[PDB]
Design a protein around this ligand. Structure first.
Ligand SMILES: N[C@@H](CCC(=O)N[C@@H](CS(=O)O)C(=O)NCC(=O)O)C(=O)O
Ligand SMILES: [Cl-]
Ligand SMILES: [Zn+2]
Ligand SMILES: [Zn+2]
Length: 215
């Protein structure tokens, strides 16, 4: 199977997670952020992730790909209970996390931004939507405090470092991509239980953390 992604893309990360959790090999391909032609040939419009199944057919939609791959061997892993507290925490943190992440993604060495035009495409589309990146970056100190404090709240909710609610669930697929991308943010104070969850899920999923290029 092949997965066509952006490295920063949280939807893409959800799809990458399930391959890692199931120990199913997959060939990753990072598309340039401005490449409409390639995803359009596969699924009809520019979007990632895109799965190429072992029958060569292409499938879009992270939700569909996650559940397709989880069921492949008739042994689904995503069986644990959902947590309203975790889901509510994610809604709260998603209220502002992109104010930190988008301007940092635009300055980072992800392969989807490896041409100038791709990087400019991202900046032009996301500034229009999120607002002036300079202004967002000038507000970093408050935003970094807010996420450090929110992670202190999450610390008390993590049941096991291998599964947020104790058994692997839909909530791990929603939580880990956010925690992975937040390792790009220099200055966050990571509590112990959250750092262990983040590291264990990075190891299980075989998805890299971003500490080495944090800004
Ligand atoms: N409903 C789809 C959403 C994928 C999506 O919007 N992905 C974004 C990248 S993410 O970093 O925001 C995307 O494909 N953007 C490309 C564009 O809109 O030009 C799914 O669940 O897989
Ligand atoms: Cl899902
Ligand atoms: Zn994106
Ligand atoms: Zn799901």
């Amino acid at each position: 199977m092949k997965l066509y992604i952006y490295d920063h893309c949280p939807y893409c990360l959800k799809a990458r997670m399930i391959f890692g959790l199931k120990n199913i090999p997959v060939e990753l391909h990072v598309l340039l952020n401005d490449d409409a032609e390639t995803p359009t040939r596969m699924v009809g419009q520019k979007q990632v992730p895109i799965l190429q199944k072992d029958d060569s057919r292409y499938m879009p939609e992270s939700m569909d790909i996650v559940h397709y791959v989880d069921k492949l061997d008739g042994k689904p892993l995503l069986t644990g209970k959902r947590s309203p507290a975790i889901e509510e925490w994610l809604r709260k943190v998603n209220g502002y996390a992109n104010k930190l992440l988008l301007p940092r993604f635009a300055k980072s060495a992800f392969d989807e931004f490896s041409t100038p035009a791709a990087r400019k495409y991202f900046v032009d589309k996301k500034e229009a939507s999120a607002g002036n990146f300079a202004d967002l970056l000038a507000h970093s100190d408050g935003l970094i405090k807010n996420i450090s404090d929110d992670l202190r709240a999450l610390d008390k909710l993590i049941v096991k470092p291998n599964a947020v609610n104790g058994e692997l669930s839909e909530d791990d697929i929603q939580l880990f991509p956010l925690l992975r991308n937040l390792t790009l943010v220099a200055g966050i104070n990571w509590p112990s239980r959250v750092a262990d969850y983040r590291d264990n899920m990075a190891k299980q999923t075989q998805i890299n953390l971003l500490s080495s290029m944090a800004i």
